[PDB]
Symmetry: C5
Subunit: 147 residues, 5 copies
Amino acid sequence: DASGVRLAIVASSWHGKICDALLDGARKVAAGCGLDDPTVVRVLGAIEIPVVAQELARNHDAVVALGVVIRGQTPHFDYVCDAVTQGLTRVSLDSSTPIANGVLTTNTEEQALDRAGLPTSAEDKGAQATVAALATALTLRELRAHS
Amino acid sequence: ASGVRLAIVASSWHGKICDALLDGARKVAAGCGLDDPTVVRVLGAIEIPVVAQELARNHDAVVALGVVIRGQTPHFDYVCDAVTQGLTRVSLDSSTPIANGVLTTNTEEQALDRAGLPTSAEDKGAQATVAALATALTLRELRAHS
Amino acid sequence: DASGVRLAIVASSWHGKICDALLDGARKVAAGCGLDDPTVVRVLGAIEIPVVAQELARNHDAVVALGVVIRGQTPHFDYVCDAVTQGLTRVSLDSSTPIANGVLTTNTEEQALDRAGLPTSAEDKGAQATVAALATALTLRELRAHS
Amino acid sequence: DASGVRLAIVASSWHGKICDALLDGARKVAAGCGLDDPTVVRVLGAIEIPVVAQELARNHDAVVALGVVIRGQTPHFDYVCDAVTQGLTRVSLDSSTPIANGVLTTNTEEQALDRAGLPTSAEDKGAQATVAALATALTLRELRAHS
Amino acid sequence: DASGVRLAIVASSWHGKICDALLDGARKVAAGCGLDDPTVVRVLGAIEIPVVAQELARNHDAVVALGVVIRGQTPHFDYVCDAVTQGLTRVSLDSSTPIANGVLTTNTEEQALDRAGLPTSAEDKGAQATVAALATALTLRELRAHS
Ligand SMILES: O=c1[nH]c(=O)c2c([nH]1)n(C[C@@H](O)[C@H](O)[C@H](O)CO)c(=O)n2CCCCCOP(=O)(O)O
Ligand SMILES: O=c1[nH]c(=O)c2c([nH]1)n(C[C@@H](O)[C@H](O)[C@H](O)CO)c(=O)n2CCCCCOP(=O)(O)O
Ligand SMILES: O=c1[nH]c(=O)c2c([nH]1)n(C[C@@H](O)[C@H](O)[C@H](O)CO)c(=O)n2CCCCCOP(=O)(O)O
Ligand SMILES: O=c1[nH]c(=O)c2c([nH]1)n(C[C@@H](O)[C@H](O)[C@H](O)CO)c(=O)n2CCCCCOP(=O)(O)O
Ligand SMILES: O=c1[nH]c(=O)c2c([nH]1)n(C[C@@H](O)[C@H](O)[C@H](O)CO)c(=O)n2CCCCCOP(=O)(O)O
Ligand SMILES: [K+]
Ligand SMILES: [K+]
Ligand SMILES: [K+]
Ligand SMILES: [K+]
Ligand SMILES: [K+]
Ligand SMILES: [K+]
Ligand SMILES: [K+]
Ligand SMILES: [K+]
Ligand SMILES: [K+]
Ligand SMILES: [K+]
Ligand SMILES: [K+]
Ligand SMILES: [K+]
Ligand SMILES: [K+]
């Protein structure tokens, strides 16, 4: 079902075409699951995701984090990804809310395109992340108090 | 260990290996006198810690089961980092053992070899469950009585 | 327009020239967005950024961290970068304030120059970090309580 | 003279012979320092050390963590070691108690044996860790409030 | 003017000669900036630094962490350094106190000597760390509440 799940999606715009595709996949999963209505917020980069996810988790049962980090010529990629990983993990446990990871972390643009659910893509990580968010929210709802 | 309240949270990303880890875990629990641990499935390893956190509120030990296998991108690294960070935090926040039965392999062959199937070299799910129960019993004896 | 957001910038001066350039990009973005007078604080090294960002976050809607860490001969680069990543991530979530990462982490000085928005630079990370900080502050203000 | 310090030793039993060796080294140091009866607790694996160290820290002035993690064929070694590192560091600072790391992290068994203070070992990490725990506890006692 | 800053220095004893060189460098800067005799505490290893830095932070405006970690034959170096990085970053933010990092992390003894401010060293890390601690303390004092 999942139609009663309050879902938020925060998507980084850094690689616009790929981020738009991840967002499309997330929104289509939500729509397919009976949510035509998720809260959608855009941020500039992946690093801005956790603070916005933290705000969203106050008013939602699940948050999907979307974005694309692609390795460049420096170590910077490692640190961007470390920040996202540490931040989203903290947000999830602070708020006891699933924060689904649909942030691609690839070595090449081709790899990211192949994982964004564009027409020729092998998979759609934004869609996958949204399923995980919704499933976990439903699971937590059942585990928690009702009587 | 018949009095220990055990939860098992298992990611089903790689379904066959997850089922095998869970079977190992369930068998140990039963042999130890626990026929009815709380068992919860999640979709990916990333989802394990938030669910383990909820389980730790009502249990003496949680076993985390799953399988992460390296692909073509650095993504494997970040998934494993997230699980490590999350489970470590949950165990300390809740003062509850959160046993690690999450395989982190380069290949499917390696994961299979560690999931306690007929020809597997070992059963990580069983190992993690023994770890969880032993630690719960140890904590019970260290703590306040009688 | 960001004319109502309270912006602070904390910049490590370890590599002074590149710091200057990052700070210039940050200030130009802020000014373009209607903020002529952000709070600017200089520190001596990247390691010192988080504790100062922590303080700044008590009195601002967004903090931009600027700096340059360039790899040397030892593993030390890794741990400086780890510290910055861990610290800024913690500060952002503790304070529920965007702490934008304009801290370059490069293998070479050439790479850092190419990312500091000098005349022949490929990009300006200081400008990018400031756009991110401001956009995120504006986003959080709209997400949060208002009537 | 550590005769007044309350020492606990938590030792993982994975690689039992090396564990026994580390524990012997720790017990010998403790007895030399005036402590014939430290609290000794065995756990099955290194991952279990931090939660038990946390419990022990409530009732002791120092905890010595002993065990051995030896690399295998998969990345698993890395994550076990990361967990131990994150966990013991957290416990030490949460409890304001020294948690000495006597957990070996080796590529080979030969390496671990050479560091376990057996008759022909190069060093005795269990002994080292116990010295560190006791010395730090004594130092903290002096820095803290007394007459 | 840094003469009114309360400085603490915690130094590990592992690699005694290099630790002494770092501490000499720190003491010179402290004396050179006209500080009251800093609180100086010795610990056995770098792992023991954060818990003592935590205690010192309760009674000081800044803490300088000094030590030397040199890579050996096993992965152990990585985890010792990770622990230090994690611990010191946490202590600084928990206590809102600069904890300057003068902990060398080198592949060789030669590298560490070259960075320990001896007559023939390229760099003086003890000194650098102490300047960073003092400057950041002064910065925080000005940012914080006063006339
Ligand atoms: O979603 C993203 N995806 C990204 O790929 C990205 C982002 N964001 N940011 C910046 C961003 O995350 C923050 O907005 C910025 O740090 C300010 O906080 C980046 O600098 N990047 C580039 C990251 C990695 C590549 C770097 O290339 P070089 O090593 O510089 O060649
Ligand atoms: O148990 C798992 N095991 C896994 O192996 C796994 C999981 N889960 N998830 C996703 C998952 O953990 C989250 O559900 C998802 O990130 C949404 O939060 C993955 O993306 N993976 C794949 C991880 C690593 C392989 C990646 O392949 P590439 O690098 O993309 O070629
Ligand atoms: O902004 C920076 N950028 C930097 O590149 C930097 C900084 N700061 N600090 C020192 C600084 O971060 C701290 O002030 C210092 O640790 C005291 O706390 C550094 O030691 N560095 C040098 C870092 C990495 C290069 C190291 O060279 P070697 O490996 O020693 O050859
Ligand atoms: O002290 C240890 N020392 C260890 O070496 C160890 C331990 N413990 N555990 C398991 C253990 O830490 C936990 O008990 C378990 O994960 C359940 O929580 C391990 O799985 N190991 C093996 C770790 C690394 C080697 C792995 O080999 P492969 O990569 O699987 O070939
Ligand atoms: O300042 C240090 N500097 C150090 O270099 C150090 C320290 N300390 N400790 C131990 C120490 O940090 C702790 O006292 C110990 O873990 C007990 O808590 C170490 O084991 N080391 C050695 C670390 C790395 C080298 C290891 O050599 P192998 O890999 O064993 O060949
Ligand atoms: K929520
Ligand atoms: K798509
Ligand atoms: K319930
Ligand atoms: K519990
Ligand atoms: K099995
Ligand atoms: K704020
Ligand atoms: K510029
Ligand atoms: K609102
Ligand atoms: K204690
Ligand atoms: K021994
Ligand atoms: K202080
Ligand atoms: K010196
Ligand atoms: K002020």
